[PDB]
mmCIF file of N, CA, C and O in Angstrom:
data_model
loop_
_atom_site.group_PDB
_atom_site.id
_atom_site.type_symbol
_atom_site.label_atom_id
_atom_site.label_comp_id
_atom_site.label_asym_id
_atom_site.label_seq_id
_atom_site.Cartn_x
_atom_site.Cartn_y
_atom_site.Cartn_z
ATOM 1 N N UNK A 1 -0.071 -0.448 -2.368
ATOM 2 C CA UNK A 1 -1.004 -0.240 -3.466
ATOM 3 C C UNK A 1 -2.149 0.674 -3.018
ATOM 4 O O UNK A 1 -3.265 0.527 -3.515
ATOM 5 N N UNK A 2 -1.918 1.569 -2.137
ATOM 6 C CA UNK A 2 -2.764 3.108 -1.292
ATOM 7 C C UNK A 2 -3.583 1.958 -1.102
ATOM 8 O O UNK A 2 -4.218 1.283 -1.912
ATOM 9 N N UNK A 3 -3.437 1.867 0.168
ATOM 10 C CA UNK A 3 -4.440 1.388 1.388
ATOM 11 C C UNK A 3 -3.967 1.589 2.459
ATOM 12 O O UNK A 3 -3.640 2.774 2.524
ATOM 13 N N UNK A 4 -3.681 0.891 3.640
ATOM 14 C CA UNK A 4 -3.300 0.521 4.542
ATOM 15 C C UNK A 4 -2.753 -0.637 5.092
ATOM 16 O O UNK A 4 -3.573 -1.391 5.617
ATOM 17 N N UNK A 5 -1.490 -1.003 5.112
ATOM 18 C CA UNK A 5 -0.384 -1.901 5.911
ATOM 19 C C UNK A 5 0.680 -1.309 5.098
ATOM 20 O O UNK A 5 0.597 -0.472 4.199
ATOM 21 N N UNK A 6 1.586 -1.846 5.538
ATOM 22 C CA UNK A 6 3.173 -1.204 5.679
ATOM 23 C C UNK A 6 3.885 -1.588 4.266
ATOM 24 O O UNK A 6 5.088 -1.350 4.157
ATOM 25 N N UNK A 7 3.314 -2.061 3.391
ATOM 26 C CA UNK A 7 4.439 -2.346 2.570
ATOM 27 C C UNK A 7 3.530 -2.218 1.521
ATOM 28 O O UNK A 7 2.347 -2.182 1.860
ATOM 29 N N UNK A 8 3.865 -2.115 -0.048
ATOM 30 C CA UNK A 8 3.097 -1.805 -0.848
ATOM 31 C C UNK A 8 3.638 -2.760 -2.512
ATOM 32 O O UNK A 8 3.213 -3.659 -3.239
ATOM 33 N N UNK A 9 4.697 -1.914 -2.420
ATOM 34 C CA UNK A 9 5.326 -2.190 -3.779
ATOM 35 C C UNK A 9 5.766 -1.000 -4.305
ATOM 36 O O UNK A 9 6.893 -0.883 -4.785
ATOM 37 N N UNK A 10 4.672 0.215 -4.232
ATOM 38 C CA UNK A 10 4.619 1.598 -4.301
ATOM 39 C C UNK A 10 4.613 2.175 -3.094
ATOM 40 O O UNK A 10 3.700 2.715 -2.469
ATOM 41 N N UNK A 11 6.241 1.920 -2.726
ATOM 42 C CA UNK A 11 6.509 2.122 -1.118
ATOM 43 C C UNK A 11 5.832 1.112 -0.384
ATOM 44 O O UNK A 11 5.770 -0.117 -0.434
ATOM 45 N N UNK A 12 5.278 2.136 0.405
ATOM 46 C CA UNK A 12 4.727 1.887 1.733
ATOM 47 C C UNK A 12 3.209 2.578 1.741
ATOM 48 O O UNK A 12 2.874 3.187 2.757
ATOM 49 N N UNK A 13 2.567 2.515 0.957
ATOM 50 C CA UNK A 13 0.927 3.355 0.335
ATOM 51 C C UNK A 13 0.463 2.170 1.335
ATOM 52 O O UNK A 13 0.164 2.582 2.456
ATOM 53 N N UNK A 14 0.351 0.806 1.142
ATOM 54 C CA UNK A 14 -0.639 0.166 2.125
ATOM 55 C C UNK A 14 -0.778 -1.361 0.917
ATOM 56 O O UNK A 14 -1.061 -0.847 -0.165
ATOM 57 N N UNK A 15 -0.718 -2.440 0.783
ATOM 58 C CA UNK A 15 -1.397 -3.294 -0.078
ATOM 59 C C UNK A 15 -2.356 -3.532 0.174
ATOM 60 O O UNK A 15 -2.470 -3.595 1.398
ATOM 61 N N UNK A 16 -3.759 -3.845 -0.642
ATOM 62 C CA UNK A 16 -4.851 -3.998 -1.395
ATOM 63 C C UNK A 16 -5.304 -5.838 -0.754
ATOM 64 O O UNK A 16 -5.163 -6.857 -1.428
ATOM 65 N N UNK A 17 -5.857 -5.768 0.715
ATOM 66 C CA UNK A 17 -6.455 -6.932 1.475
ATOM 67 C C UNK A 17 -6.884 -6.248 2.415
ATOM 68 O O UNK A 17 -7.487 -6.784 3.345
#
């Protein structure tokens, strides 16, 4: 969810913590 860590949902952008 464009941040940073490896997995997102939207790829690999980063999830949102």
């Amino acid at each position: 969810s464009k941040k940073s860590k490896p997995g997102d949902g939207i790829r690999g952008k980063g999830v949102r913590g």
